[PDB]
Amino acid sequence: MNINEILKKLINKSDLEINEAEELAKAIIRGEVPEILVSAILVALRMKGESKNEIVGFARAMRELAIKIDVPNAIDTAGTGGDGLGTVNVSTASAILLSLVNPVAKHGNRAVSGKSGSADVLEALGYNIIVPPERAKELVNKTNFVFLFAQYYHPAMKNVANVRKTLGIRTIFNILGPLTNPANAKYQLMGVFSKDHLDLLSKSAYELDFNKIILVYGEPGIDEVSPIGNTFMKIVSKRGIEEVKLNVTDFGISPIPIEKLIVNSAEDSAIKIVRAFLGKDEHVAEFIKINTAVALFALDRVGDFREGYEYADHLIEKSLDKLNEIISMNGDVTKLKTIVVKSS
Amino acid sequence: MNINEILKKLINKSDLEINEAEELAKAIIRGEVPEILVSAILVALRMKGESKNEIVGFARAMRELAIKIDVPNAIDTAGTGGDGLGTVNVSTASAILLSLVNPVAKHGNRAVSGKSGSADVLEALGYNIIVPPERAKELVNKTNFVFLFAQYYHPAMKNVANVRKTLGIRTIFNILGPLTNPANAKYQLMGVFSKDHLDLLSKSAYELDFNKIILVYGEPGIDEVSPIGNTFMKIVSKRGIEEVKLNVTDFGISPIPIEKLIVNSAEDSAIKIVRAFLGKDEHVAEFIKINTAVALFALDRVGDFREGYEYADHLIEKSLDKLNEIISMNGDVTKLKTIVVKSS
Ligand SMILES: O=P(O)(O)OC[C@H]1O[C@H](OP(=O)(O)OP(=O)(O)O)[C@H](O)[C@@H]1O
Ligand SMILES: O=P(O)(O)OC[C@H]1O[C@H](OP(=O)(O)OP(=O)(O)O)[C@H](O)[C@@H]1O
Ligand SMILES: [Mg+2]
Ligand SMILES: [Mg+2]
Ligand SMILES: [Mg+2]
Ligand SMILES: [Mg+2]
């Protein structure tokens, strides 16, 4: 693996082979490549426009270097993020409903834009987001749910922290985290932030070896099933990549005004979700349920999205309690009660 | 003027304003921009493809911080380099013949591609490549020739050496060289390795305040007058940029074997050259004459491309003697003669 040959190759706008990319990624994440060259590379890759092999290459590298646990049968609902509209922490909430009928390995980080980060609500809720791997497995067995805090499950990325911060621009590492679930979940719902990444990441995904992963991009430009209108999807499986366009009305609901689904703090997000669980905020609930319906489909638990939406209705009614047993086994329920009160 | 804004601008592939480039180049050459961003900026600037205005901005920044000497009437023959052929140092040689008729302020550096660096030959021929401004003035009056070592007349450029070396790829700075003659020569024959850069550089030079500078691209893929076929050149002055296409034959000569114009070290170049001066290397000598010919057309001491080849035919006969006096005034004549002995 010659750093120079690689760089010159990217500069000429030639895509790498999966293996070149993986060795390249491996060197960078290991800390064996001078910052000047990591910067050059990340910048070259972006201006060339990353290709499938490249994504595949880097993903495989990151999985390899990441702290792992084995729960392939699990499902994750992490999205790439980056839309920055501060919407409520949907997929996290949605991860609570899923754990009721299937092991859930929720991968995520704290907020980058705003403060509605997956790891932040869980914290605001009473959950102890920093879980050691040996414990992580125990929890998923006892409660069917664990949150895998990325910073900690991908310690190696520390060797790229300075370049990324100094560069202060989006790079290939901004859309890779969801393809790197630390527990190797084979089923997942991952939202991307642009129609273009929907095409690239689904093609990449097709080779990262999932049983079923559903990539989505919903209007007005968030990485979720769209709560106001259309949702562009890609259902990936050993069979291929299926294209599917969906409107929020297909779930049998009227479009939800998005201002209703936007938060301004972690606690505010937590309250939105509990109130949703408690039936005191139909809007957030419909948002949590349209996302869960797509996840449920990924698991092959329903025949269509409507069935998925109705089924999700039965899950949300048991989620508050579910949330309580999960947080009791790994956190502080008094914080959950406080949040509950704060929403009654 | 913010670096992060410049970076976003380039990542977006938008060309900079001359003023912007100049301030950007200033900070970089002044060593006040973090190596990480300098790497990114240089890479993006290359992938986007540099613009006439960016070239002009950097050139002006560099010129401003360079150390200078007064000799505008002088002529130079430095080329962009980087054609990857390892050919023999023709313009350094072509400069020797020129000092026979016009003061020569030759700008150059050590090789990045082989050893065939114009500065390396001289070192090998016995010349003392580091010439202080005061001494340089003296040498040009007496011998009518002087070498301006880029690494000495551009002391600030050392603030970009680590990034450039670490990168190990060509950037904007690898084409700015000949446009920043320390003696501010108003005349010269600028060689370029690609027809594309031939256009960019010609248009840029037009605004760089020259009396007459001829840019040339050699058919085989060399940045000199072609020894095997066509030569594309632009005659830029204050009145415009003329288009001109040549063939080795228009010099009344025949195609020359590039196989014999190739060198594999500083000394082989120093030998091919002296060998041609001794009239013992028909081919090397022909390659020199044709370039010299164009450079004479530039000084307007010949109004015909074949008349210049004829005039060059004279000059080479007195060449060795000139080289001899040049070396004994600023250097070690010993070396030179051992080379003569090795050229027989
Ligand atoms: O900024 P957003 O509109 O939220 O988009 C980013 C992602 O976050 C949402 O879930 P959650 O809040 O749990 O975040 P995560 O997917 O990043 O963990 C949702 O599932 C998106 O995929
Ligand atoms: O790689 P090359 O085929 O040599 O082309 C690069 C330049 O070098 C040649 O002269 P010289 O060898 O003296 O180098 P210089 O122009 O860098 O001084 C010639 O003037 C070219 O313009
Ligand atoms: Mg999400
Ligand atoms: Mg989201
Ligand atoms: Mg040259
Ligand atoms: Mg050359």
UniProtKB/Swiss-Prot annotation, chains A, B:
Its cofactor is Mg(2+). GO terms for molecular function: anthranilate phosphoribosyltransferase activity; magnesium ion binding. Mg(2+) 2 binds at residues 223-224. Keywords: Amino-acid biosynthesis, Aromatic amino acid biosynthesis, Glycosyltransferase, Magnesium, Metal-binding, Transferase, Tryptophan biosynthesis. It comes from the Archaea. Pathway: Amino-acid biosynthesis; L-tryptophan biosynthesis; L-tryptophan from chorismate: step 2/5. InterPro entries: Anthranilate_Pribosyl_Tfrase, Glycosyl_Trfase_fam3, Glycosyl_Trfase_fam3_N_dom, Glycosyl_Trfase_fam3_N_dom_sf, Nuc_phospho_transferase. The keyword Phosphoprotein does not apply. Its EC number is 2.4.2.18. GO terms for biological process: L-tryptophan biosynthetic process. Binds 2 magnesium ions per monomer. The keyword Oxidoreductase does not apply. 5-phospho-alpha-D-ribose 1-diphosphate binds at residues 77-79, 82-83, 87, 89-92, 106-114, 118. Anthranilate 1 binds at residues 79, 109. Belongs to the anthranilate phosphoribosyltransferase family. Homodimer. This is Anthranilate phosphoribosyltransferase. The gene is trpD.
